[PDB]
Amino acid sequence: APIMTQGSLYNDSLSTNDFKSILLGSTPLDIAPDGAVFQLDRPLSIDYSLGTGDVDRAVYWHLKKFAGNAGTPAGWFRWGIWDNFNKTFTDGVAYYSDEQPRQILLPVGTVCTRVDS
Amino acid sequence: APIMTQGSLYNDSLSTNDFKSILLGSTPLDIAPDGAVFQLDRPLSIDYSLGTGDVDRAVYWHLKKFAGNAGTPAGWFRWGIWDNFNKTFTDGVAYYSDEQPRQILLPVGTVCTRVDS
Amino acid sequence: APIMTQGSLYNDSLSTNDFKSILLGSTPLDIAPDGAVFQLDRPLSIDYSLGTGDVDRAVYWHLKKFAGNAGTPAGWFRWGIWDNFNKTFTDGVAYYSDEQPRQILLPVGTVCTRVDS
Ligand SMILES: [Ca+2]
Ligand SMILES: [Ca+2]
């Protein structure tokens, strides 16, 4: 049971710190419990800004599930860092939306592997 | 049969909006039908600039074949976005060549999967 | 025997042109001889600067082993470019450490393939 995305994640679909699970088109991700952490087999690049409206670029390989509700049953994911030794997830930097060209950050077929207990 | 690149794509080989197919060293790519779209298993990073000579970086996962001519018999690829729902390809941002270090953007062994039709 | 990393490479562990082999948590990598070159199945993103105040990003797919000393017995890897035709390795750009968010550049499970002869 390898979990693969079935929908593309576009940069214009990111909120400041998360995105909706539904975008990835994966029932396993949609039903994953709160706090589940996944490692991606493809990098998730996140443009950020340290100030002055300037864009810089970060890379993340891990997503943490935030359980949904009636309006958004599939919930959300935050990108960040999974420490496999200490078993900790740390949220990544906020996404900065400016004038970047539209991009598929994670394409269809991205493999997601649960890494927490 | 899986199509793998046999030659590295270097950043200093990109034109503003394409690169020559021959660079990838793949006969299946060289003779792919005009307009064929491929998804990559590795990100293609394209440096761009929206102004002031400032470089930012975009990611692409899709290439569209442009048929050759007598001068370039194997033709070209453009990078861009494949919409697998609406079955459309949109060319990506222009590559901005300035003072970046030389880089292999796509190494030997990159897997290319046809996704159109 | 595919070689997979067992520890994450964090951006805050990079020196200007190398990092300690031991960080990747792999005995095969640790014992690899001076001069061994590996290709990665995942991009290694290296932030650099042109020197006017801004962080840009380069991509590398190759590492070369450099023999260590009493303080770092397993030695170091440098990122760079492997030319598979001419059998040459060229060191990549200096890493620029500024105020970037902490990032896993290469996660656990990155596959390293020896490519020098
Ligand atoms: Ca910047
Ligand atoms: Ca810049």
Residue numbers in the entry:
A (entry chain A), B (entry chain B), C (entry chain C): 7 to 123
Copy the relevant paper text.
To gain more complete and detailed structural information, we have determined the crystal structure of the truncated P-domain (residues 214−338) at high resolution (1.2 Å). Since it lacks only the S-domain, crystal packing of the truncated P-domain remains a trimer in the ASU, with a similar orientation and formation as the P-domains in the GNNV-LP. The high-resolution structure of the truncated P-domain has allowed us to clearly locate two Ca2+ ions near the non-crystallographic three-fold axis, which are coordinated with the C’-D’ loop to stabilize the trimeric structural fold. 275 motif on the C’-D’ loop from each neighboring subunit interacts with two Ca2+ ions and two water molecules through electrostatic and hydrogen-bonding interactions. This calcium-binding site is buried in the cavity of the protrusion at a distance of ~37 Å from the S-domain. Notably, only two of the three Asp275 residues are asymmetrically coordinated to the two Ca2+ ions, and the other Asp275 coordinates with one water molecule. There are two water molecules at the calcium-binding site providing the trimeric contacts and stabilizing the protrusion. At the interface between the D’ and E’ strands with the F’-G’ loop from neighboring subunits, we also find two invariant water molecules associated with 278VYWH281, Gly299, Gln322 and Ile323 through hydrogen bonds, which are also essential to maintain the conformation and stability of each of the trimeric P-domains. We consistently find three glycerol (GOL) molecules located between the B’-C’ and F’-G’ loops of the three P-domains, and one polyethylene glycol (PEG) molecule at the interface between the two F’-G’ loops from neighboring subunits. Notably, all these residue variations are located on the surface of the protrusion in the structure of the truncated P-domain. Our study identifies a PEG-binding site on the P-domain of GNNV CP and confirms the enhancement of GNNV infection in presence of PEG.
Here we report protein crystal structures of a piscine betanodavirus, the Grouper nervous necrosis virus (GNNV), in four different forms. The overall topological structure of the GNNV CP consists of the N-terminal arm (N-arm) (residues 34−51), the shell domain (S-domain) (residues 52−213), the linker region (residues 214−220) and the protrusion domain (P-domain) (residues 221−338). The S-domain comprises an eight-stranded anti-parallel β-sandwich with three short α-helices, which is a canonical structural feature similar to other virus CPs. The P-domain folds into an independent structure, including eight anti-parallel β-strands and a short α-helix connected with loops of various lengths.
